[model samples]
Target: NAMGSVPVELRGDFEVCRRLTRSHYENFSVVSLFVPRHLRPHFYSVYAFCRGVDDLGDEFAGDRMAALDAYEEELRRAFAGEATTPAFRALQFTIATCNLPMEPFLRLIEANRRDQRKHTYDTWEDLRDYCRYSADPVGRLVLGIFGCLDDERARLSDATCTALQVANHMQDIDRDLALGRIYVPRADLEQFGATLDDIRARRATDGVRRCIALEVDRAQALFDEGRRLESLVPPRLARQLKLYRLGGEAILAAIRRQGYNPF
Candidate 1:
């Protein structure tokens, strides 16, 4: 039985989460350093959950939908206190102790669920809706964990997280186009006179640069709007948020430095 096979040493299970967090080379160092000492384990658990879902969504070549469905089932059982995997075991603890809601977790899972069938978005709003599922939930989950959840912070956090996702998409344009997925909105492409042919050929024209610049401008404004969230949180949390905001802006700057040609 899955429940019978589940490990009982919840702290040891958390170690598994911690290892997964450390292995990632991104903002986790700032995460470990700036997050309040007591809350780090919860962060590890959340990061582990995100990493697992994203890997299964993007990297698992065989039957990705089935694997994600199994993960969603694991989420259901984890909430029921019957998680078997190390990541979910730690997540189960975080959920119980933080009194977290299932909505954010389910939203994340549904984001991956959407990944299987939906690749190209038709409009900017459509892409934003995808960000609502794929990115905003993580910020909401963090705010909930830090006891900073509110309508205002949630709105601002959504902006910041969506900006982060957009920045990432901009930076990975070449890689994403190679995968037959274009996070760039189709309307913007047509508006800027940038063709899908340009993306497919991995060549950046003046129109393509303009298209990338327009999206980067949008993300920059979102970052500007969301930076106020740093002041709303605790000092330690503010520092962490500042680092994240800065990181996103730096990415946009790098894109600009490359003349808006991410390739």
Candidate 2:
């Protein structure tokens, strides 16, 4: 279909996948602008895949389970040489052209799948395990695209992405609760004596604030780790990292400004 000329529908799908339309990375990609011009399209293609998988998780509401299952099927089909959905279709194209690996992309799908079943984790380790799929693999995927999958960089990227994810969770506490979702690790909640009831009552007690502050510190440290990836690469990429870090920092600051309360 993409040989001599592109189909109108395919063109529409590709356009929709462009950076401007997607929100998660579009809103969070500070490091994106810094991406070298040549590498930007590849990153865009990668992000499109991310956005597509995320939609399967978030868009269908009560039908999210079915949507995710279908998405997983599509992912399998993509690897098997099928391209019906725009994301998998274009994603398959990227894989073929750029040698993109399936591990990170599949990990993202796994994370979203986990979200469907597990809303609360008992320990930070459990949460980190979730982050390994939800957040960390994204950074590694980007690095893999650029041939920089060194352990050190991957570790740093993991920290940063995890931190960012935690910050988003913190900021979305009220929103998550409204949807019967909670992302805070159970230990932290238990340690702080914060309960769903307490949260629903709009109570951010001193203990709650302290717990949030602790999480914020962890996120800041992780951001610092991932932030270095910016300077380690080209100038454009550096700016992208800075922007990514700044966006997280901005939201973190906003959370603190709201007195550590999402309500």
Candidate 3:
């Protein structure tokens, strides 16, 4: 009733993933802006791969389970030299050339896999645990790409990535909630006497403003913690790292400009 998977093919000289409007990819590229030109190709491969997995988790809201399963299968195919998808082919080449590790890649897959059911959090700790998988892996992967991965650097990188995720979530609170997803911890919400209704009300109260400002402070601290990664890498790489951290910081600033209200 349906045609089999498309045949494997090679994308020409410029190997682009062609899914820029995609949220994950958009964020990935934006964050990678500071990376050196020589390294951008490999980063692109990583970003594209992450984007593919993210689409499975977020875009295919219907049949999300099946989508993830198929994507995982694609991973197998990619490593096994079966390059049916252009994205997979690009990723395969990057892996072979860069000597990137499997853990971060698998961590990303595992995180998205967990997203099928790991849906909500009751506390900041719980949401942060989710960020460990959903967000931190990307930074780890980037460090790996730049050959700068070490205990100290990775620790700071994790802090930055996790903070970026939280800040972006705050920025997109309304957008995320419309999809029935909430990243803010319920305990934090309660601490300010807030509720889901307050989130959806599209109105800002003093309590809500105070709550979001509190979260912004938390995210800013994370960014500050990641600042060490800048000094650890080459000037160029460090600049890019600074850009990613700043971009997230800018998002938080934007939210503050909006009075910390998603209305």
Candidate 4:
């Protein structure tokens, strides 16, 4: 029902998407002062699409996997030149306008599908692979929109995006645990002698603190690699990237402030 929930009298599906973007809470924006005026529509379209997919993945009360399958089908249909819903109608326009590839969007969907089936990662490399789909694609899409997509830039962007993903996973350790998910790699836990029981008990042992500190160091190194990315981008995008980087750093700092006790 969320697909067609928008009324027919809206100016256009793009407008519907725009309104949806404004209604939601965001620290980042499609219509930010730092963003160019011409790019707001595309940003709105992309944000709406992200919000819709996330809602279906995490907020849908029933049959979440089925909902995602239908969403992926809609994505395929959209790329095939058929627009089925307000979100897709706007998304199609944005995709065509930006010459965006289908792979990143598909990867986002695939990430949500993985969420339904997989809760823990076996190794750091495995967790990084998950972030390759879950986080890096969004950055790639944004870079494409900015006419900045390239192998070199994507490599840097991937570092920042993956670091942000890990930092977020760190910040939300308690919340994710409540939902039966743990993003800390099992290898890292075993390396630091942290246990799942300590996490479940909401107790931060010395081992748990050490494990978190190690992950924080990894995130900081990735952020350092990404520092030059901001300078390489256009002014507006550079500012936004700074904000993104700072936000992730703030999370890391907060984790440390709490004595590396995410719980």
Cα lDDT of model 4 by residue, 181-213, tens digit: 888888888888887677778889998899889
> Could you tell me every candidate's TM-score relative to the true structure?
0.91, 0.82, 0.83, 0.91
Model 3 / residue 167 / CA error / Å: 1.0
- Top candidate on lDDT is 1
Clashes of each: 0, 8, 1, 0
Write the residue-wise lDDT of candidate 2 on 84-106 in tens digits: 87666766665665666678877
What is candidate 1's TM-score against the reference?
A: 0.91
- True lDDT of residue 166, candidate 2: 89
Q: Please provide, for model 1 over 1-263, each residue's C-alpha lDDT reduced to its tens digit, 9 standing for 90 to 100.
A: 11222246667788888888779647677665776657878888888998888888666787887887888899988899999998898899889888888989989988988777777878889989999999999999888878898899999999999999999999999899878898888888889888777888888988889989999999999999999999898888888788888999999999999999977
Residue pair clashes in candidate 4: none
Model 1 RMSD to the real structure?
4.3
User: 192 in model 1: Cα distance from truth in Å?
Assistant: 1.7
At residue 197, candidate 4 shows an lDDT of: 71
The per-prediction CA RMSD against the true structure, in angstroms, equals: 4.3, 3.9, 5.8, 4.3
How does residue 184 of candidate 1 score in lDDT?
A: 84
Clashing pairs in 1: none
Candidate 1 vs candidate 2: which has greater lDDT?
Answer: 1
> Which tens-of-lDDT digit does each residue in 24-55 have in candidate 3?
44465565556666666676678778777777
**In model 1, which range of ten residues has the least summed lDDT?**
1-10
Ranking of all candidate structures by their TM-score, best first: 1, 4, 3, 2
- Whole-model lDDT, candidate 4? 0.83
